[PDB]
Structure 1
Amino acid sequence: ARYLGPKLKLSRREGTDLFLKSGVRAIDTKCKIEQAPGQHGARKPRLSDYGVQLREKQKVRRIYGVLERQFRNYYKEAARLKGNTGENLLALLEGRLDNVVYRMGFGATRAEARQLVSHKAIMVNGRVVNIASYQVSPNDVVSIREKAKKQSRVKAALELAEQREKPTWLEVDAGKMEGTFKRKPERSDLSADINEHLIVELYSK
């Protein structure tokens, strides 16, 4: 139920930086980010129509740390919901508790955030929530609980975040270690490189 293997390999495969590592050390220094993995890395075969879409799908899934069935379910949900499908899907993905935590800056990485969530560190409206797939609604305060507040990792994560670009759709306090999910993000708030449309297309063949 999780990808436990090499993280930078995935990134390499994708092409881009997936932010699967903390962002202390630049991704180029840790790995040959340009060259794809394995023995046949330097060769770059011309990718098919299906294939590109698939790759795109993988990228998004990889980024958030979501396996396939769950992803499919999410997609379905998005489709069901009113409005643009890809956008909806993206929103749903964002809404995940672990993702939210990561955004806030309590986990260096999304994986870290997920771990924290698992290990009963994250209260959501004062009630300990353990499920990484939990959807954080608007006006849901989400905080570190007092036991995990002392952890040196959390502060490091926060620091890292502070270097990173801040999301408009949250509001987080470094001292209090508690953040309010103000609103579900508009597509413009998220990364432009994600071609949600491709993903949508893929799940219609």
Structure 2
Amino acid sequence: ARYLGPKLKLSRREGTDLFLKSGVRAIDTKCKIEQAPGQHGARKPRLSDYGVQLREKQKVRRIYGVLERQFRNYYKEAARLKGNTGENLLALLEGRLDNVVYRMGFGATRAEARQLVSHKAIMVNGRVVNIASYQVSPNDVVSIREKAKKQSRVKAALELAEQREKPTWLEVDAGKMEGTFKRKPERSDLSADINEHLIVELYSK
């Protein structure tokens, strides 16, 4: 399923930072960013109109760590759901359980916070849930189990997470390590960078 590879080569192919690493520092400047994704890295291409639609879909797919069969089912459920299907696809990607626990600060990366929720450690509404792709509804409280609480990793990501922009569609206490998903995140709160309409145009091709 998952990538299980070098997670800065993916950020160099897209150019921008995908927040795939914890970032105790800033740009690591140990990775040669914005210069070369490969051997022919100085050779920048024409990047045609199909390719600019492919790069934006592969950018969003590499942030959350989903695969294409799982991503195409996200688009398919976003198109039939009422409203703007551009921000409906992002409300479902930000409704993932491994993403919400990242934005609450309990994981330093997406792949680290996926390993917490996959290892039977994180419960929703007082019930233990095991998967990464659990769609959380509004006013659901997600807690951390006491056997994996006090884990030399979960609070260590919490003092790292004051610089992570304070996502204000969910309130986090982080002393008791609980948090509720208040409402769905609107389009005006997601990074101002991704062009979701290129993803809707790529699957209509």
Deviation per CA, 1:106-154: give whole Å up to 9, x if none. 1000101110000011110000111100001100100111111110110
Question: How many Å apart are 1:170 and its aligned residue?
Answer: 0.6
Distance 1:43 1:3 in 2: 26
Distance 2:36 2:62 in 1: 16
Q: Which moved more, 1:169-178 or 1:27-36?
A: 27-36
Q: Which residues in structure 2 correspond to 1:52-201 (within 5 Å)?
A: 52-201=52-201
Distance 2:30 2:58 in 1: 22
Deviation per CA, 1:49-82: give whole Å up to 9, x if none. 0000100000000000100000000000000100
Tell me the SS of whatever aligns to 2:18.
coil
Distance 1:177 1:121 in 2: 12
Distance 1:201 1:30 in 2: 36
Question: How many Å apart are 1:163 and its aligned residue?
Answer: 2.3
RMSD of aligned alpha carbons: 0.8
Gaps of 5+ in 1: none
Tell me the SS of whatever aligns to 2:158.
helix
Deviation per CA, 1:150-190: give whole Å up to 9, x if none. 10110111111112210010101111101100000010011
Question: How many Å apart are 1:27 and its aligned residue?
Answer: 2.2
Distance 2:129 2:121 in 1: 8
Q: Which moved more, 1:180-189 or 1:34-43?
A: 34-43
Distance 1:175 1:30 in 2: 34
Please give the TM-score of this superposition, normalised by the length of structure 1. 0.98
Aligned residue pairs: how many? 205
Please give the TM-score of this superposition, normalised by the length of structure 2. 0.98
Question: How many Å apart are 1:25 and its aligned residue?
Answer: 2.0
Structure 1 runs of 4+ aligned residues shifted over 3 Å read none
